[PDB]
Structure formats: C-alpha cells, structure tokens
C-alpha cells in the first residue's frame, strides 16, 4: 500500500483505470538498512527496473544518490547531491571514491553545524547536463528525539527519461516503516539519456570534539535508517478521487482475493464465484518480430509509370518480398483521391498481408468517385467492379501535364456497352460489337450495333469533372500463408520460458514462448487448437515453430464471503486432483469438482449457502 | 474553392432521431474523408467520428455517419438525444493540401413570464469630481431574455452615449441586463430628471432619478 | 499519454506580430511522424484552419491566410510556435494547437484554447464609482446596490463583494464595448432595505493586466 | 479467315519500308490487329497493335519514336511503316489478329497469323553474278561416276535458283545454301553425280535465272584436258 | 523480355515431355494467363493453348497445359516426327505495358545411323586465275552437321583467313551436305606447293592433298 504514484498526467475523476506500469509490489520483502552510533552501511544496489527509496529522517542525514554503470570514470554517470547551500545535479564521468561521504563539523565554542568536507568524486572530464537550484539555508542540527520526517522517492529509467516522484509525510514511529496510503506526484523530468545498472547511497558524516582520532576513525554516525525496494512491472487498479489525488490502490497479482477486485474493477467484492486466472505472472518484457527482408518495395514504378494502362485493359502488378513503407503514400498532397475502407491508416505499418496487388489506369473525375465498393455506372458496373469486402483501397491524383495533349488524346478507351454485370476483380477485353435489337450483328457496324469501346476526349480545356485522373488501386489479401510483405517495424530478440508479450507478424498477445516438436506444412503459418486460440508461431526470422503457452491455464474459483464481512478466502482449483497453485496453505480438501484449499471440511450436513459444485457447499461459521 | 455547407440551427426533442448534413460545393464528398467534431461551449473540440463511419473509442454508439456521393453531402445521424449532446458540430475535410471545416451545427436539446425588476442609479459624487458622469440602469430577474431599454432626458429620447449589455441567464433561470448612459457633468444637471424605461413583453417598467 | 499546452500573450495590438507557442508534454515532436496544425475559432463562429507543419520543414497554409503565417518547430525545446503578421480586429479568435495523427485524418488531441483579443488604445486601469441606493432604487421590501467599473482595457476584471462573503443576489454583468472602444461593466447585489444604514457594503475590483486593485465602499445617497 | 502479306523486300541501312497485311476471304471487323517480329535465331517480339474500328495504334515501350503503324477500315488493310532501318532489324514480320476474352487473367492471344514478310538490309548494291565452270580431274575419277557442277560468284540476293539442263535433270541434283562473308557477299555451290560414259557424248550446261537483275546467262562446262 | 525458358529440350516418341516457362511477378505472378504458340521450321506460328485450359479448333488433344504460381507448364503426350517445332509462351506484362514473348524452347527428336564423313577437294580451274581472285572450295557430303571442322593448311602454316562454316541442307535421302569457300589471290596461289582441306568428325580425320602444278 506504498509507492503508488500517478502513471499519467491525464486528469481522472470518479473513474477507475487499469494501468500496466512499474509499481511497488504489495507487502514486498524490502531490504532494511540501519545506521545507529550506539553501522555506516552504504552498499551498491543494482538498478534492474527501479529503486524505491523509503527513508525516515530526524536530523537531515540522507543527502542524495549516485547513478551510473561502472562508477569509475569510464561510462556516463549522474550526480544528485544536496549540500547545505544548493542542489547539484550533474551528468559527468566522475571518478568515485570507494566510500563517498559528506562531512559536517561541530564546534564546542559555539553551537553551530557547518559542512566542511566534500568527498564524493575525484574529478570530472566531460559534462553534458548540469542543474543548479536556488540557494537555501539548511539546519543540519541533530535531534535527541524520535524520527519525525519520512521521505519516499521513486526512480524510473524509461527511454532515457528520469522521472522522480516524492512526497513528505510527518510520522512518529520509532523503527518500523509506517503503514497507511500515500500519493506521490512528479516534480521534474530529467532527460539524462544514460544507462544505469547500479546505485549507491550517500549519507552524512558528523564530527565534533567527542570523536577523537584521525579522519578515518574520529567520526560518528547519526541515527537514521532507510529502505530500498524494487519496482516490478505489475498491473494495478488506482482510485482517483474528485480532488485528483489517489487515495487507495488495488494489486492484481498479490493474492487471489486481490485479483478478484482487479477483475470486478471495484474495491468491494460480494459473495459468489469469480474466475480471475490461474497462477499468473505479470509480463516484464515486450518483443516484436518481423521478417528481415531489407529491400524496398517497387511502389515508385506503379505511381511514376511512363504510360498508364487503359480502363478496360488495366495493368496488374504483384508486390512482395519487401517491406511496405506507406508513409510516402498517405503523407503526400499530390494524391487528389486517397479514401480507404478497412485499411486503417497509421496502422498499415503494423499489420501484415499475403500480397499486394496494384492496378493502374486513367479515368475522369466524374468516374473516379465511382470506385467505391458499392456503386453503379459506366465504370463501376462495366469496366472495373470492386467487391463489397474489398481489402485495400484506391489512390488517385490529377494528370493534365501527362496523358493530355492538344488536338485530343484518344489513346485511352473504356467499355460502354455490356450484356451482363462485371464480376468483382475481373478484367474483360472483348472487342465484339454489342447488339441491342434482334437483328444479327455478325461483325457489322450498322444500326443497333455499336462498338463497346468508346474513345476518351482528354482536352486540356475541359472542366474539372472531365479532367483525366491517374488512378492506382492497392489491393491487399489475407490468406493462410506466410506473410512476404509487411510493415517497416523493427524486430527485437527472442526469449523463451517467460511470460512475455509478443507481436508476431501483426498478431499481438500475451503468453509463454516454448520449444515445440510439431512439424508444420510449408504454406501454413499459424496453428489453432480446438478452442480456436493461437498456439504456434512460425517466426520467419528463425523459421522455427515455437509453442505458445498461456500464462494462466488452469481454472480457479475464489470463494469470497464478502469484503466487509470477512477477509479470509478459499481458492478452488477445478483441474487439480489433490503443485501449480498460488499457495499450498493448509486444510486441503479434494472434491469431485476439484481441489479446495483454505476451507475447513466438516462431516456434518447443513444448508447450502455458497455452492461449490457436485453437491459441495461452504459457509462461514465459528 | 472547396467548402462545406452545414445547417446553422437544427433542433429536435430528446430521445428521437435527427440527421445533420454536410454538403460540398465543388469537390466531391467521396474524394476525401469527413471528420465530425463535437465542441461544447468553453471547451476544446473532440473527435466524435473519423473515417466517415468509424466511431473512436469513448463516443456512444448513437454517433453514426454516412456518406452520399450522388448529392455531394455527408450525413450525421444521432439517435436518442440526451442532455449533454447540446454542442457545436463541425464536419472536416482535406480538399487538396488545405483542411476545410464546416459551417457549424447547433444540435439543440429542446411558459411563465418573469417580472423585470429594474433599478436605476445616478452618477456618484466621486465620478463628478473626476469630470465624468454615467447613469447605470439595471435589469434583472426577467424571462424571456429579450428586453429593450430607452433612456429619457427632461422630454427627449436619449441615444448618444448609451451602452447596454445583452441579457445573460441568471442562477435562478431568469435573465439580467444593464444599460449605461454616459454623460458630462453639465448634461446631468442641465435637465431636471433622467429616467430609464425597460420594455418587456409589451409592459414597461420605468425608474427615474434627479440631481439631489 | 500526451498533452498540448499553449502560451504567449492574450493580447496583440493592430498591425503587429503575433507570437503563440504550443508546448507538447509527455511526447516527442520529431518521433512518430505526427503532423502539427494550428486551428482558430472566433467566438460564435466556426472553426478556421490556419496551417499545418511536420517535424521537418514542410509547411502548408490556408489560401486566405497565405503570406501571413510563419510557423517553426524547435525540436530542442520540444515546442512549435506560429507567427502572424498584420493582425487586424477580425483576427479575434480562440487559437488551438492540435496534433494530427494522419495527414488527412482526425485532429486526435486538442489543446486548451487561448483567448486572443485584438484591440487598439492601450492597457489602462479602471475607474470605480459607487451606486448609491435611495428610495427610487428600491421596489418593495428589498433594495439594490452595485459598483460601476468604467473605462478599462483589457478584459477581464473580477469584482467581489465583502471579500467574497456576499454571493447571494450578486450579478456581475458581461462587459460591453464603449463608444471610445473601452470595456465597461458593473456588479450588483440585492439586499433587504432594513440593512441599508447599518450594514457596510464594499466592492473589490481587480484588474490583473494593469495591476490595479480598488476597494470602494457603497453608501446610501446623501442629498446636497 | 486468311491473312495475306506482301512478298520479300530488300532495303538500305537507314531507309524506310512499307508493307501491308491484306485480308482474304473475309474482314477482321471489330478484331484488334497486332504485329509480331522474329529475328533469325531469336524469339518473338511484340511491337504494336491496332483496333481498326477506332483507328488507334498502341506501340511497345522498346521502341516508339521510329515506327508508325496505321490501318484502313474501309479497305480492311493494315499498313506497317518503319524508319531508320538498321542491320539488326533484319527479321520477318507477321500481322497478328488479337482474340480477347473475359477472365481473371485476360491476356491477349493471337489466333490467326500472316504468312510473313522478309525485310532485309544490304549496304552493297545489286551487281552482276559470275559463273565459272568446274570439272573433275583424272585422280578424282576413280570409279564409274564423276562429280561436276557450276559455281556462282558475287550474286545477290539469296533466292536465285539453279536449274540443270532447264529442268531436264532431277536425279542426283543438290542445292547448297550460301554463307555470310566479311564483305557481305553470297556464294553458293552445286554438284551432281554422273556416269563417266556420258562425258564424251552429251554435254552439261547450267541455267541461272536472276529475276531482280534481269539477266540469264548460259555457260558450257567441259572436262579438263590436262588431267 | 524476361520470360526465360530452357534453350533446348529432348524427348522420345513414347515419353511425356514437360516444358516450363517462368517469368516474374509483373507478368506471370500477377495472375495473367499464358498463351502457347507452336512455330514449325518454315511455318508461321499458330495458337496452341489459350486460357491455360482451352484448346482451339484443329489442334490435337495430346497438347495439355497448366499454370500455377509464377510458372507455366506444358504437357505433350505423343511426340511424332512433325513435333519438331519452337514453342513460345506469351502473356501480358504490366511493366512493359504490352505483350511479352518467351525465349523459345528447341525440341528435336531425331536419330539416324551416322557414318564416316566423305570429303572432296576441287582445285580452281584455269579461267578463275584471270579474275584476280582464288576460290578454294572444299565439298563435304555424307556427313553430319553436329561435328563440322574446316581447317586449312598449306603444309607449312595453318590458314586463319577466309575460313568459314556453312550450315548444311537436308538432301532427299535423309542426309546433310555443305561446302566451304576460301578466299585467296592468284599471286600467292602458285607460290605455295599445295593446299589441303581437313575435316574432323567424332575423332575421324581424312586428309587429301591436290597438286596445282
Ligand atoms: C514520383 O516521382 C516524384 C518526383 O521525383 C516523387 O516526388 C514521388 O515521390 C514519386 N512517387 C513515389 C511513389 O515515390
């Protein structure tokens, strides 16, 4: 119930939101550090995914922390030090001492504390970021009483951005970390942009006339303590009050009773049966994989062709074995017509298609509006019909400098008469004379016998409706086949036997990647089980079939006798014959419906209050 | 020279259906996408419909759009009107490297007469030693919010120096308005009295003041 | 997520240069290839598109606003600003900066609207005059009183009665433009007539642009 | 129906040519007419096409600024005109009638083809052929038969037939095709097998007819006296 | 253009022969049908298979074709003596905006009892000396066009000028005959002692030397 902060800056009121960020696990076994004069412990703790610095203070002991990789003037390291004058934040290659400390001296003649030793780093060569705060006066006076001030800090390192969250709460506890709930808020964002894998705590050193000896032994340690916690990425539920401050939080991975609140999206759980999940581990990494074909697609040839095909005999090109970069197409002002249905712009870069079909032809403005999937006319019904479930779309622009010359441009023809409706994705080249009446039309251009092909008059002086437009139609097909054309997204590495979110060839999901011995036929890429769930991935980068294991596979029934009534709960596992369970515990009872733990079984027979299954009933008694 | 034509004021009672049009003059409405934005007063506009039929996540199901290419008009259908739907609606397009918005549509949610309490004040002594003079007429607690105010001299309708505030809705569902007659210190004292007359629903309420 | 915050002055003089800066918080201007556009809206009128910019130097402007819009992107400060030249009285509009996910798509995220009021003359403080109640200022058992705020520029002014202790019956009217192009209003309150000679009524007028705070006691009229 | 073209023609390297494809037994009304060339030893090439109803010609992208193809609907003829002839352009041209159909593929196919028109180039002008006698020697006549014939030199073009005794001899005759030379000259040969007993009683003569050269010479062949 | 086919194929009268025509993704991979044409040696090409499944009038049913993927297949059951012809595949090319033709496959099915070549050397006559030219012919007969070597030597150095190879023509008795011509001058004709023509065929070489003087 500690370390909960605001993951985003979006203001929320009376709405519960589920966030997946790096948060403090509930009731975590954090390490305790003690420093009593009567134990100057300043170790180096690794920086895996975040350090939660919880410290209580009464005499201004903890000053700052050092962040870096090697801490030996070989890699970039960050300084945060708060001396008696200002706040210093620097990012340089500091040569750190073995035991850095800050020395504060005391005089017997006059009651005053003044800092005189600054032993943190040897020298700094190259510096990138430096921050100096406003000057202030700091007491630095020891107190003979108990602890008064509690300071909590959150450190996060994502994409090179350092965000610090802190909140001051006055406490009066002696040694134990105080309970309760607190909300932390951001104060500054530091774009350090360095890699940090370890950190060391820097404390304060006090000297006076009561500590004889040299510099290495004539000193005392102030009474202070601090704790270090890790921020494992887990899903949490946060309650945002009307004032904008979080007053409580719910963990979705602490206990089976806590997971019921996450599923129900409420802070109170009523009596009943709830199925959250099996033994569940929150994902820690995200991986995306795409084919390593570093070849540019031939989009330019289709859109910059010297000669465009006719309306009836429209060219068709197949695009494959390359990465499709649509950012040159959908981000240009030349394309007069760029309407798409189901393509989902700003997402093409993510999804994968079996193949790309490109059709090139020139038509007028009044007929380029007819390339909608549902339309009728002299073009959409006799020349080129698009299906209702057409995947892909049509790109058109204006062309009067090209394909339009003075004296007429009669090099383009279109179908005018036909005996039947054209099928979708069908091109017909028939020069046979159309017949209207019952008279024979065996190759005669007489009455009631007109040529199906009609010439196009592309005069430069025509109206904007009669202008000749260069039209390119992009067709995408989804088939049960390995994808050979996809987006330009990067492909990361591969991990095994871990609950990791995966993004394979445009398919996203959560699961565990494991080796599989199944043999896959070459033209099939995905496999599904009886439950119609994804179970195998071809992984074209390595061409190895990987089994998909769900992170939670078993059935779990949580017997919660309310929230305000009681807190103890009973967990029932349907597919367990009493182990892959949350906890063994005690009072394990095996029923016909499964294995029940956390509940006491009696030989009596009372009324059924909370049904379990197969004649098993449970109730809350003394 | 592609522009979007919209109805300026569309009204319909709650719970029923209504169709909002968006007609393009020169360019075809099927050439480019149509985005509908619902902007409440005193707030930033929010995207309620994009890609001409795709409702973004967060908006209700009732916000449905359709495109008619034959009449060059984009359509927005709302079913089951509610209270918070009272906001401005604009249709967007792209034309050719020039984003073009719509005219604006005021989707409206859709009787006792309140008495026009009138109070008039003369210019203060502090204003007079500042070589200024202003007569302040105050109208409050009236409904409907349409009133006309006519100042008076000793026996003359005063028009010069008259400034007035539009009737604004009060907290008690009524309306309030003010009138200001700016004068010189000599003009305030050259006439025996000055009066403010407020006309509301045919009835007239008059207050007068004199230099005293 | 991401958000957009605007800055710059809320005023500009006629025939001058406008400076409005939109700052992006929680995201990156260069990353993602997201277009950035400025859209203004006059009070009571429809939205008007001004221009759009990319993370690169690509710029497209409205034909009516051509040769007057200058927009630049500062990637180091993670912000982009727009400059308007020869601003007139018809440019009074609420300016919005909005990220554009697509070139021809939705303005997905709209920043809060800054208010720009283009007007002549200069920033000058108000003159506060009391409204003395009398027998002709009451109609029945209740009486009215107020404070006159005259000849100030620009908007807004805040009027509070007895340091906010009096709120019931208080009516602060919207400001209107004088014959000399000056803003003016009054804030009034209705009180029982019994508390005229025994209760003190003080109005507190504040004009933040001119750094002026004036408190004015309101007393019944003294006939001379 | 049937498609008939003109005969073989010889041109210059950088001259203009004109051939036609006349339809016999019918007309190709409402049927596209295309032209396909074929170099000797190479594959077919597509280089043009006419829809004769509207009279519009579509050319290939390999060459477009040197070939102009036209057709006449009234006479039902297609005319091929070419400019800037080169040495590589020595090939044969066929008039192909397209026969389209409706389908997913819908590729134009040529069902009816012409008889071909030989278009060849030759920088050297037409000259007068020379014929020299050839007789066997004593060593070459070891059995009851001898080999004797006539050799023609510097003759142009290739189709120059050789007749033995004005067609009176049909057994043992042979025709030898010529070969390209360094100067572009052509030279063919002809040898027959005859018994030695007829060498002293009846004579052998060669008759050569040259239609383009308008010449027809007669030469006498006699056995060698020295050997 | 890019419609590459095998340069030649071999077959038997009683065995099936499969001809493969592979193009690219703009002509064959785009879904366009392929048309097959048969060109006899001396006859204009004619339509054989259109639409990848249909056959016109006058064609035997032995010819079969199929198209799948980015390649085309042609199946012939019987291979008679008249089956020696050039086969071409033609489709529509989107990039070239016109019809594209195949490179052509050479199908030859023949066999005959080849024997040793026979050569004859005919020296130029006396009347050819006054023409300021020397035509040394080398008549070859009862031989095969597969292995034709024409080497000229003058008993002291090989001749590398005026040598050529001529394609033989079919006789009336299933035989091929050809000849070779050598260009010289009468000035050097009497300088050398003798000349000869050498023909090599499958390791068999026959040499005859004539005596001009
Ligand atoms: C076509 O060519 C123009 C001019 O070079 C270029 O701007 C455009 O990007 C090209 N089209 C494509 C699809 O690359």
The beta-carbon neighbor of B96 closest among A333, A339, A340 is A333
Question: Cα dist. A210→A106, A207, A220, A412, A588 in Å?
Answer: 10, 8, 9, 104, 62
Task: Suggest the residue from C148, C175, C182, C184 to mutate for an interface test with chain B (most B CBs closer than 10 A).
Answer: C148
What single DSSP character describes residue E128? G
* Whether C102 and A10 lie within 8 Å, measured CB to CB: no
* Whether D30 and A425 lie within 8 Å, measured CB to CB: no
The beta-carbon neighbor of B121 closest among C110, C132, C176 is C132
Q: Does D94 touch chain E (CB under 8 A)?
A: yes
Domain assignment of residue C94, yes or no:
yes
Task: Suggest the residue from A369, A370, A467, A471 to mutate for an interface test with chain B (most B CBs closer than 10 A).
Answer: A369
Smallest CA–CA distance from A337 into chain C, residue: C104
Contact in structure between D87 and D119 (CB atoms under 8 Å): no
* Whether A317 and E94 lie within 8 Å, measured CB to CB: yes
Task: Determine the Cα–Cα distance for residues A453 and A457; give it in Å rounded to an integer.
Answer: 13
Q: Torsion angle, CA of B58/B63/B69/B70, rounded to 10 degrees?
A: 180
User: Which parts of chain E fold into alpha helices (H)?
Assistant: 186-189
The beta-carbon neighbor of B31 closest among A333, A337, A345 is A337
Contact in structure between A379 and A469 (CB atoms under 8 Å): no
Whether D29 and D117 map to the same domain: the answer is yes
Task: Determine the Cα–Cα distance for residues C209 and A356; give it in Å rounded to an integer.
Answer: 62
Q: Among D96, D121, D146, identify where a domain stops.
A: D121
C35 CA distance to ligand 1 centroid (A)? 20
Whether D166 and D98 map to the same domain: the answer is no
* Whether E29 and A318 lie within 8 Å, measured CB to CB: yes
* Whether A315 and E97 lie within 8 Å, measured CB to CB: yes
* DSSP string of E143-181, one letter each residue: E-TTS---EEE-SSSEE-SS------EE-SSS-EEEEEE
The structural domain count of chain D equals 2
As a whole number of Å, the end-to-end CA separation of chain E is 58
E186: CB partners within 8 A, 6+ apart: E128, E129, E132, E133, E134
Domains of chain B: 4-108 (2.60.40.10), 117-209 (2.60.40.10)
Domain assignment of residue D226, yes or no:
no
**Tokens for E82?**
């008249």
Task: Suggest the residue from A333, A374, A377, A465 to mutate for an interface test with chain B (most B CBs closer than 10 A).
Answer: A333
User: Which residue minimizes the CA distance to atom 11 of ligand 1?
Assistant: A300
Domain assignment of residue C55, yes or no:
yes
A330: CB partners within 8 A, 6+ apart: A338, A345, A346, A348, C102, C103, C104
A300 CA distance to ligand 1 centroid (A)? 6
Task: Determine the Cα–Cα distance for residues C217 and B11; give it in Å rounded to an integer.
Answer: 48
- The CA angle A173-A175-A177, to the nearest 5 degrees, is 70
A302 lines ligand 1 (CB under 6 A): no
**Which residues of chain B neighbour C171 with C-beta distances below 8 Å?**
140, 170, 176
Residues of the domain holding D38 = 2-121
Domain assignment of residue D101, yes or no:
yes
Task: Determine the Cα–Cα distance for residues A617 and A621; give it in Å rounded to an integer.
Answer: 13
**Which residues of chain B neighbour A368 with C-beta distances below 8 Å?**
31
Count Cβ atoms within 10 A of the Cβ of residue B155 and give its class: 0-12 exposed, 13-18 middle, 19 or more buried: exposed
Please tell me the number of Cα atoms within 13 Å of A443 on its side-chain side. 10
Whether C194 and C146 map to the same domain: the answer is yes
Contact in structure between E73 and E66 (CB atoms under 8 Å): yes
User: Residue D145's domain is classified under what CATH number?
Assistant: 2.60.40.10
Contact in structure between C132 and C219 (CB atoms under 8 Å): yes
**Tokens for C179?**
């014959």
Whether D145 and D36 map to the same domain: the answer is no
Task: Determine the Cα–Cα distance for residues B162 and E199; give it in Å rounded to an integer.
Answer: 127
User: Which parts of B97-184 fold into alpha helices (H)?
Assistant: 125-129
Task: Determine the Cα–Cα distance for residues A468 and A363; give it in Å rounded to an integer.
Answer: 6
Contact in structure between D12 and D123 (CB atoms under 8 Å): yes
**Which residues of chain C neighbour A332 with C-beta distances below 8 Å?**
103
Task: Determine the Cα–Cα distance for residues E30 and C58; give it in Å rounded to an integer.
Answer: 37
Q: Do chains E and B touch (3 or more CB pairs under 8 A)?
A: no
User: Which parts of A146-245 fold into alpha helices (H)?
Assistant: none
**Tokens for D72?**
């006449």
A296 lines ligand 1 (CB under 6 A): no
Helices (H) and strands (E) in chain A, counts: 3, 43
Beta-strand ranges (E) seen in E84-144 are 86-93, 98-101, 105-107, 118-122, 134-143
Contact in structure between C145 and C201 (CB atoms under 8 Å): yes
- To the nearest whole Å, the CA of E203 is away from the closest chain D CA by 25
What single DSSP character describes residue C138? B
- Count of residues making up chain A: 622
A328 lines ligand 1 (CB under 6 A): yes
* Whether E179 and D176 lie within 8 Å, measured CB to CB: yes
* Whether A339 and B33 lie within 8 Å, measured CB to CB: yes
Q: Which residue bears the tokens 């180091």? A: C76
A299 lines ligand 1 (CB under 6 A): yes
A300 lines ligand 1 (CB under 6 A): yes
Count Cβ atoms within 10 A of the Cβ of residue D157 and give its class: 0-12 exposed, 13-18 middle, 19 or more buried: middle
Which residues make beta-bridge pairs with A398?
A469
A507 lines ligand 1 (CB under 6 A): no
Solved by what technique? Answer: cryo-EM
Whether D29 and D115 map to the same domain: the answer is yes
Whether C46 and C96 map to the same domain: the answer is yes
Smallest CA–CA distance from A368 into chain B, residue: B31
User: Beta-carbon neighbour count of residue A206 at 10 Å?
Assistant: 21
Q: Among D121, D143, D164, identify where a domain stops.
A: D121
Q: Does B134 touch chain C (CB under 8 A)?
A: yes
Whether D108 and D192 map to the same domain: the answer is no
Nearest to C81 by CA among C69, C90, C93: C69
Whether C27 and C101 map to the same domain: the answer is yes
Contact in structure between A272 and A560 (CB atoms under 8 Å): yes
Domain assignment of residue C172, yes or no:
yes
Is the C-alpha dihedral spanning A435, A439, A441, A444 positive or negative?
negative
Whether D109 and D161 map to the same domain: the answer is no
Whether D110 and D144 map to the same domain: the answer is no
- To the nearest whole Å, the CA of D153 is away from the closest chain E CA by 9
Whether C19 and C109 map to the same domain: the answer is yes
Is the C-alpha dihedral spanning A117, A119, A124, A128 positive or negative?
negative
A394 CA distance to ligand 1 centroid (A)? 17
Task: Determine the Cα–Cα distance for residues C174 and B67; give it in Å rounded to an integer.
Answer: 42
Q: Which residue bears the tokens 């939109």? A: C22
Q: At B14, phi and psi to the nearest 5?
A: -65, 150
A294 lines ligand 1 (CB under 6 A): no
Three-class DSSP category at C61: strand
Task: Determine the Cα–Cα distance for residues D81 and C6; give it in Å rounded to an integer.
Answer: 71
Smallest CA–CA distance from D58 into chain A, residue: A411
Selected from 3.30.70.1840, 3.60.15.10, 1.10.1240.10, 3.40.640.10, the CATH number assigned to the domain covering A288-490 reads 3.30.70.1840
* DSSP string of D24-82, one letter each residue: ESS--TT--EEEEEE-TTS-EEEEEEEETTTTEE---SS--SSEEEEEETTTTEEEEEE
Q: At A261, phi and psi to the nearest 5?
A: -65, -35
Domain assignment of residue D227, yes or no:
no
Domain assignment of residue C224, yes or no:
no
Smallest CA–CA distance from B33 into chain A, residue: A339
Contact in structure between A494 and A543 (CB atoms under 8 Å): no
Q: Among C91, C118, C145, identify where a domain stops.
A: C118
- To the nearest whole Å, the CA of A511 is away from the closest chain C CA by 26
């Amino acid at each position: 119930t500690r370390g909960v902060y605001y993951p985003d800056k979006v203001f929320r009121s009376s709405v519960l939101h589920s966030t997946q960020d790096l948060f403090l696990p509930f009731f975590s076994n954090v390490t305790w550090f003690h420093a009593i004069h009567v134990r100057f412990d300043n170790p180096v703790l690794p920086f895996n995914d975040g350090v939660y610095f919880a410290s209580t203070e009464k005499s201004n002991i903890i000053r700052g922390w050092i962040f870096g990789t090697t801490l030996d003037s070989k890699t970039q390291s960050l300084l945060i030090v708060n001396n008696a004058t200002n706040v210093v934040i620097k990012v340089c290659e500091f040569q750190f001492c073995n035991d850095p400390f800050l020395g504060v001296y005391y005089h017997k003649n006059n009651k005053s504390w003044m800092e005189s030793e600054f032993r943190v780093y040897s020298s700094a060569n190259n510096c990138t970021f430096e921050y100096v705060s406003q000057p202030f006066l700091m007491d630095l006076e020891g107190k003979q009483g108990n602890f008064k001030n509690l300071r909590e800090f959150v450190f996060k390192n994502i994409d090179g951005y350092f965000k610090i969250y802190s909140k001051h709460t006055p406490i009066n506890l002696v040694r134990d970390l105080p309970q309760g709930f607190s909300a932390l808020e951001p104060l500054v964002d530091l774009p350090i942009g360095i890699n940090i894998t370890r950190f060391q705590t820097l404390l304060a050193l006090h000297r006076s006339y009561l500590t004889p000896g040299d510099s290495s032994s004539g000193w005392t340690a102030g009474a202070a303590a601090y704790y270090v916690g890790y921020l494992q990425p887990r899903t949490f539920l946060l309650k945002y009050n009307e004032n904008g401050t979080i007053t409580d939080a719910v963990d979705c991975a602490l206990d089976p009773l806590s997971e019921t609140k996450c599923t129900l999206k409420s802070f109170t759980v009523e009596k009943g049966i709830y199925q959250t999940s099996n033994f569940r581990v929150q994902p820690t990494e995200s991986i995306v994989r795409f084919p390593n074909i570093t070849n540019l697609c031939p989009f330019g040839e289709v859109f910059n062709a010297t000669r465009f095909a006719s309306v009836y005999a429209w060219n068709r090109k197949r695009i494959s074995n390359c990465v499709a970069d649509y950012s040159v197409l959908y981000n240009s002002a030349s394309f007069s017509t760029f309407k798409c249905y189901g393509v989902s712009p700003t997402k093409l870069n993510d999804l994968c298609f079996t193949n790309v079909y490109a059709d090139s032809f020139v038509i007028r403005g009044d007929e380029v509006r007819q390339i909608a999937p549902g339309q009728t006319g002299k073009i959409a019904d006799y020349n080129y019909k698009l299906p209702d479930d057409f995947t892909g779309c049509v790109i058109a622009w204006n062309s009067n400098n090209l394909d339009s010359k003075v004296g007429g441009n009669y090099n383009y023809l279109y179908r005018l008469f036909r005996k039947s409706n054209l099928k979708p994705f069908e091109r017909d080249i028939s020069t046979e004379i159309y017949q209207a009446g019952s008279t024979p039309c065996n190759g005669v251009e007489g009455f009631n016998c007109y040529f199906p092909l009609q010439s196009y008059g592309f005069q430069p002086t025509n109206g904007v409706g009669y202008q000749p437009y260069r039209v390119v139609v992009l067709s995408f097909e989804l088939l049960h086949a390995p994808a050979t054309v996809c987006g330009p997204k990067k492909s990361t590495n591969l991990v095994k036997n871990k609950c990791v979110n995966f993004n394979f060839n445009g398919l996203t999901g959560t699961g565990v990647l494991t080796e599989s011995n199944k043999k896959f036929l070459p033209f099939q890429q995905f496999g599904r089980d009886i439950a119609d769930t994804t179970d195998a991935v071809r992984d074209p980068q390595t061409l190895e079939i990987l089994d998909i294991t769900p992170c939670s596979f078993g059935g779990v029934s949580v017997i919660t006798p309310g929230t305000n009534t009681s807190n103890q709960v009973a967990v029932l596992y349907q597919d367990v014959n009493c182990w892959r369970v949350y906890s063994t515990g005690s009072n394990v009872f095996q029923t016909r419906a499964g294995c029940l733990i956390g509940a006491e079984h009696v030989n009596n027979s009372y009324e059924c209050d909370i049904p379990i299954g197969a004649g098993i009933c449970a109730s809350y008694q003394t | 020279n592609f522009m979007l034509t919209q109805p300026h004021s569309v009204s319909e009672s709650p719970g029923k259906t209504v169709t909002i049009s968006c007609t393009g003059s020169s360019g075809s409405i099927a050439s480019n996408y149509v985005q509908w934005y619902q902007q409440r007063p005193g707030s930033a506009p929010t995207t309620v419909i994009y890609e001409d039929n795709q409702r973004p996540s967060g908006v209700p199901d009732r916000f449905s759009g359709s495109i008619d290419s034959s009449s060059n008009s984009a359509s927005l259908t709302i079913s089951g009107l509610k209270t918070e739907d009272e906001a401005d609606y604009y249709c967007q397009s792209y034309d050719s490297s020039n984003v073009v918005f719509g005219g604006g549509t005021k989707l409206t949610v859709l009787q006792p007469k309140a008495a026009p309490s009138v109070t008039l004040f003369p210019p203060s002594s502090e204003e007079l030693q500042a070589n200024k003079a202003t007569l302040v007429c105050l109208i409050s607690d009236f409904y409907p919010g349409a009133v006309t105010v006519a100042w008076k001299a000793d026996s003359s309708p005063v028009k010069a120096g008259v400034e007035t505030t539009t009737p604004s809705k009060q907290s008690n569902n009524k309306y309030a308005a003010s009138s200001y007659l700016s004068l010189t210190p000599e003009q305030w004292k050259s006439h025996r009295s000055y009066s403010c007359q407020v006309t509301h629903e045919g009835s007239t309420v008059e207050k007068t003041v004199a230099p005293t | 997520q991401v958000q957009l915050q605007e800055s710059g002055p809320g005023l500009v003089k006629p025939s001058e240069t406008l400076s409005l800066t939109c700052t992006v918080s929680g995201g990156s201007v260069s990353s993602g290839g997201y277009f950035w556009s400025w859209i203004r809206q006059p009070p009571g009128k429809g939205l008007e598109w001004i221009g759009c910019i990319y993370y690169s130097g690509s710029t497209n402007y409205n034909p009516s606003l051509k040769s007057r819009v200058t927009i630049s992107v500062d990637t180091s400060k993670d912000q982009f600003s727009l400059k308007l030249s020869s601003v007139t009285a018809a440019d009074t509009a609420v300016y919005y900066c909005a990220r554009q996910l697509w070139l021809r798509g939705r303005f997905d995220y709209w920043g809060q609207g800054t208010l720009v009021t283009v007007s002549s003359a200069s920033t000058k403080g108000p003159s506060v005059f009391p409204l003395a109640p009398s027998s002709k200022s009451t109609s029945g058992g209740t009486a009215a009183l107020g404070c006159l705020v005259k000849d100030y520029f620009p908007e807004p002014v805040t009027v509070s009665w007895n340091s906010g202790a009096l709120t019931s019956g208080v009516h602060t009217f919207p400001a209107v433009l004088q014959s000399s192009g000056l803003y003016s209003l009054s804030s009034v309150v209705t009180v029982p007539s019994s508390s005229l000679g025994t209760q003190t009524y003080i109005c507190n007028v504040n004009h933040k642009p001119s750094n002026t705070k004036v408190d004015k006691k309101v007393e019944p009229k003294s006939c001379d």
